[PDB]
Design a binder for this molecule. Structure first.
Ligand SMILES: NC(=O)c1ccc[n+]([C@@H]2O[C@H](COP(=O)([O-])OP(=O)(O)OC[C@H]3O[C@@H](n4cnc5c(N)ncnc54)[C@H](O)[C@@H]3O)[C@@H](O)[C@H]2O)c1
Ligand SMILES: NC(=O)c1ccc[n+]([C@@H]2O[C@H](COP(=O)([O-])OP(=O)(O)OC[C@H]3O[C@@H](n4cnc5c(N)ncnc54)[C@H](O)[C@@H]3O)[C@@H](O)[C@H]2O)c1
Ligand SMILES: NC(=O)c1ccc[n+]([C@@H]2O[C@H](COP(=O)([O-])OP(=O)(O)OC[C@H]3O[C@@H](n4cnc5c(N)ncnc54)[C@H](O)[C@@H]3O)[C@@H](O)[C@H]2O)c1
Ligand SMILES: NC(=O)c1ccc[n+]([C@@H]2O[C@H](COP(=O)([O-])OP(=O)(O)OC[C@H]3O[C@@H](n4cnc5c(N)ncnc54)[C@H](O)[C@@H]3O)[C@@H](O)[C@H]2O)c1
Ligand SMILES: O=C1C[C@](c2ccsc2)(c2cccc(Nc3ccc(F)cc3)n2)NC(=O)[C@H]1Sc1ccccc1Cl
Ligand SMILES: O=C1C[C@](c2ccsc2)(c2cccc(Nc3ccc(F)cc3)n2)NC(=O)[C@H]1Sc1ccccc1Cl
Lengths: 328, 331, 323, 325
């Protein structure tokens, strides 16, 4: 006859599995920004956090739990052991560590993924994996290989942020909200991204039709500088604050909304492009994909120029060059 | 002319005054948590950021701007100069470094008072009709400091106070009962932090007084040890500092809740630090948390809580202690 | 090859099922208000609409569908056949007469079996009046465990009370706490004991609260809750917005498994000396399994007698019903 | 002392003018759908409702007020007198009755409303929903004396939303990712812009040159025919349209109230574009901010699409010239 017993009469002890659970692996700057954005978008009924730094993991879990009054996510759990991640609909991988080269980081992150992915598959075999950790294009393949999951359930963040940055920069130039400034950045994430000028428009008005020299070395207004700013801005943010968190966190939560709510919205995400643009290797690049409750259900076939297809093909060859030497 | 001129025809390029602007002073862990929580709640049509560290300031602003597509705040500005804060409806002060395990309360006071001596006048200059929401610690002491420097009426000088303390309390209360913190009512008042007062009489679930059902609630004679719920509020705060070095998300979410009541003129009750001269035998200019009605004018009214002799004494002790520090402050 | 096949390359087409399906039965004023409220709150990935009038049903579905760009619900279906309601998490019954019992029992004789058929693990949410009797009618026919059979009850009555309380105190209803229990409508019970703002008891500050002795006439606040229902019906012809919003609020707690306390009509048999199978409003913890738990309110001898009276009156009607 | 005084200590007894006030004129099915959507989107701090039928008006005000606990708009008001509408940022006109005859009928109604709206909210943005929207936006503009930026019509925002829903249903994609612009005269004379129809920036006309032509194998012209055919179908099936228009008005209200600077196909003064030299209000993509229509998107139209806008303008002016104010 405790206070709970005097106040509450129990009708059932029938404990059930979470219906719309999400897991964030890596409680670093990126992962925590993904965690807060998801929590504030009301996408999960349960949020699980995983990391190797036990103390930092407990602290972040508690800090999010103390905001439970202001949230609509009734359960916030964490732990080093992946048993906490059981029955997750979506698993977001952000684990890693932000002079070093890009090749040095690959096998370094592959060894990390060699533990995470099996443990994720163990407790959540029917989940959708959203890979954020860089190189995202390579690590999405790495995860797809180790998991043995079909292509659709292995999604890479890719150029979702690149396009968001593009649409914002396009928006500032024209003085219009990014929501109404349409433009697509595809292929390899980072420096090797492809700005698809043909699709760059405002209210169905192709900016290439009005300005035929758009995104060329000829261009009077030099619109190619907008894409140059997409790569520059990212480097600038690291030079100014040392890392990125908010923008990536928001972009990930948008992808989470499409998947969790089965919206069938189009996003520039990393999927296997094998069979397209003369690519025959098992490589992942960003193309606009249809995101639903089972991940990439479909992908949009973008008509590109010979110069744009070659850019994707070069990226595809370079990524496979690193992939064929990888140990699994 | 140019692509912009060929694509878009202009009807006017006039006025451009902010209707629902918010400023965040101090782009640290707490300041940035307030910012993201505010942006994701669609409370501002303009967000401004201020800080002494130019690099971090520019970096944080850009990181927010790059996420614009997933937000409804069409303008994010930042600067060391306070011209960027002009016409704010609400200014949040999260400036000044967090308390070092080495430094004490009095050391944190003196340091943050010197900081405020230049923040508050500059905030007032560009936003003379704004609401000041003080977060920087010791929140109670600094809400008084802000009030004195600004020359603003009591209503427009609000301190975060016990909003977080009560939020932690309702979470813990909910965890024990298997109920959502929204349905678990409990108020933590007075001095924010270690000296906070849990009001056991107001502890309820669906109007049912927990103290009426369980008279031993709050007392040391409690077999269920419910007094540990308030001890855990204090313990958890210290624990998060030991575990991750600071607190950001919890305070960021509670400040956004306060901002929501102000910006939308909701008139919801919140445990926030306000001028308590006239209540509980207090005769000095001390700012302690009591349930306040928050709207477009900040604190329009406050709720008179029936405290027990013991609960009253703790409020009086904090008032006597805080006035002791405040009476020896140079302006 | 079509323009679709040329634009979109498919990976998988096997029609995936909804994970958060909600069904609304009766596309009347109430049903449609529930629908829009549920849609504007992003609670469903699929919305199902059922009505005997096929023309109004098709139009209501179409009108909602044309606003899909502003909503986050990718699929909105409708039909006379309950096959369109297959695998719903929550089913809302708003179908019925705006004697009032007799016809609605005959309606539920067809509705309830057809719902259970296509959605056996769903939570039933009864709105149709007399809500307290029809929740029993729905529970009786379904054979569902009492936790999965919920009635709107006094959630709206408590909403109206907190609005009036708020208007009187100049405070938002969110910060004005008060509970209206028992029967929905006239026989409802205001729990003055629990009526508060910021934990401060109004009955402690104003002992006359609820009595006829009361100079401030706070007993009128509860009478106004009853008055307003009839008043809106007289002025407008019916009530829709308020019930729609309250139903969506319950839907949010059930769908998101929040575990928030709500005054909803439940099997109160076992408490307050009640022995008959009657559904009356008491504070309930709502989640993914419906009413998982119940809040035992400390009631006065007057309040407790009012619920037993409600129980005896309702059962008196319930025993005379033919199933 | 009263219970209120014993419980609450006052610091200042207010009162400030409403900061984000919205007014809805006409508490019919359209206006009440605009009301619930605005409320559920947290766009206003004050909502004012105005109508001639006092009984319906008080009943609707009370119903919304009873759900205040589930809303974030602390003040809902109503009245026959326009004093309840004072200091509004946006005033929405939905006054009329479902359906030259209907024009002059609604002109006479507007002849009273607009002056009363201007008297209490002279700095407000006017949003016209009442049909014929393109003609009644002109009527309101001339009566108000407001500059063209503060006089907006719902126009083809709903026509585009319907097009995007149908487009999305065909392709199995969300209407958010299906982009299509329906411009000009709202209703029967609406103009679909095929050159702008796209998914992920991929022009559907470029891949399928038969798009929007008679020789179309997939008959995409029927998508636009279904846009206008849907309106009549809903009218025939349930007697009126409410939910779809309410949501689209809330969308416009969001862009205005939050100064988003988003692009919407709304009815505006088109004198000077596509060979139109008359004072007519036609739908084109507009930037919607705090000052209403600040700018507009100059859509590249084919001579057939251009001629259709001219034909709309000619028919509208024919009606507009025969009106008495
Ligand atoms: N795809 C994109 O668009 C995009 C954008 C920005 C950042 N990123 C990437 O996000 C990643 C992380 O960034 P960050 O700022 O959060 O780094 P961080 O150093 O702040 O945090 C990384 C976390 O990973 C954890 N971790 C390392 N090994 C682990 C393991 N075996 N198991 C569990 N956790 C482990 C660390 O403990 C650490 O907490 C980087 O790789 C970065 O490149 C991707
Ligand atoms: N009221 C509460 O419940 C509560 C909860 C947690 C933290 N806090 C308080 O919030 C404050 C900050 O927390 P933090 O973790 O973000 O510290 P922080 O060191 O991470 O950030 C502080 C920021 O203030 C900036 N700053 C310093 N001097 C400044 C000046 N003169 N003008 C403008 N900006 C200046 C710093 O550059 C820094 O960005 C602390 O005082 C802390 O105690 C209050
Ligand atoms: N619980 C509450 O708080 C509350 C509040 C207000 C109204 N109500 C009740 O809700 C009910 C309906 O309200 P209303 O205003 O929408 O009335 P309404 O007449 O406008 O709507 C009733 C609808 O039910 C349909 N219907 C009738 N029989 C049906 C059947 N066998 N299957 C499917 N659909 C059927 C009708 O065609 C009609 O569309 C009434 O009983 C009313 O009293 C309850
Ligand atoms: N632009 C669009 O996309 C679109 C779509 C659908 C409907 N509509 C239009 O919206 C209008 C209204 O639709 P409805 O179904 O709500 O009509 P309704 O019959 O349901 O009610 C209209 C209201 O206008 C009121 N009204 C009449 N004269 C008034 C006056 N002088 N002052 C204040 N109120 C007055 C009536 O009293 C009535 O309540 C119609 O003209 C209709 O054509 C526009
Ligand atoms: O991919 C990342 C990680 C990175 C980054 C990577 C290359 S430049 C910036 C990031 C985050 C945290 C640490 C680092 N470290 C780092 C910086 C420069 C470098 F050359 C190697 C490592 N980088 N920051 C980012 O915002 C994103 S998006 C991005 C990056 C480049 C071009 C265009 C875009 Cl849309
Ligand atoms: O007031 C703060 C700042 C603080 C803090 C202060 C005292 S214990 C924790 C915080 C933030 C950043 C740094 C520090 N460090 C610090 C703490 C105590 C000390 F003595 C020296 C340094 N503290 N963290 C917090 O969560 C909040 S809320 C809180 C604090 C104590 C009890 C109950 C509550 Cl709801």
């Amino acid at each position: 006859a405790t206070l709970k017993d005097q106040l509450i009469y129990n009708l059932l002890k029938e404990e059930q599995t979470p219906q719309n659970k999400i897991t964030v692996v890596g409680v670093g700057a990126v992962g925590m920004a993904c965690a807060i954005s998801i929590l504030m978008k009301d996408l999960a009924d349960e949020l699980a956090l995983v990391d190797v730094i036990e103390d930092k993991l407990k602290g972040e879990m508690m800090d999010l739990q103390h905001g439970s009054l202001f949230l609509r996510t009734p359960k916030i759990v964490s732990g080093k052991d992946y048993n906490v991640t059981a029955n997750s609909k979506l698993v977001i991988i952000t684990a890693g560590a932000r002079g070093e080269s890009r090749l040095n980081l690959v096998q370094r992150n592959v060894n990390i993924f060699k533990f995470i992915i099996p443990n994720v598959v163990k407790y959540s075999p029917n989940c959708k994996l959203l890979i954020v950790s860089n190189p995202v294009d390579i690590l999405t393949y790495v995860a797809w290989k180790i998991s043995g999951f079909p292509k659709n359930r292995v999604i890479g963040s890719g150029c979702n942020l690149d396009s968001a940055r593009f649409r914002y920069l396009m928006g500032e130039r024209l003085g219009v909200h990014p929501l109404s400034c349409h433009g697509w950045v595809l292929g390899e994430h980072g420096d090797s991204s492809v700005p698809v000028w043909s699709g760059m428009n405002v209210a169905g008005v192709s900016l290439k039709t009005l300005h035929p020299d758009l995104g060329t070395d000829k261009d009077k207004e030099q619109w190619k500088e907008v894409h140059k700013q997409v790569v520059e801005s990212a480097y600038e943010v690291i030079k100014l604050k040392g890392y990125t968190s908010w923008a990536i966190g928001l972009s990930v939560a948008d992808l989470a909304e499409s998947i969790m709510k089965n919206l069938r919205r189009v996003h520039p995400v990393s999927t296997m492009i094998k069979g397209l643009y003369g690519i025959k290797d098992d490589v992942f690049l960003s193309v606009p994909c249809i995101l639903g409750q089972n991940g990439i259900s479909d992908l949009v076939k973008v008509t590109l120029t010979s110069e744009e297809e070659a850019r994707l093909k070069k990226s595809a060859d370079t990524l496979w060059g690193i992939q064929k030497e990888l140990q699994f």
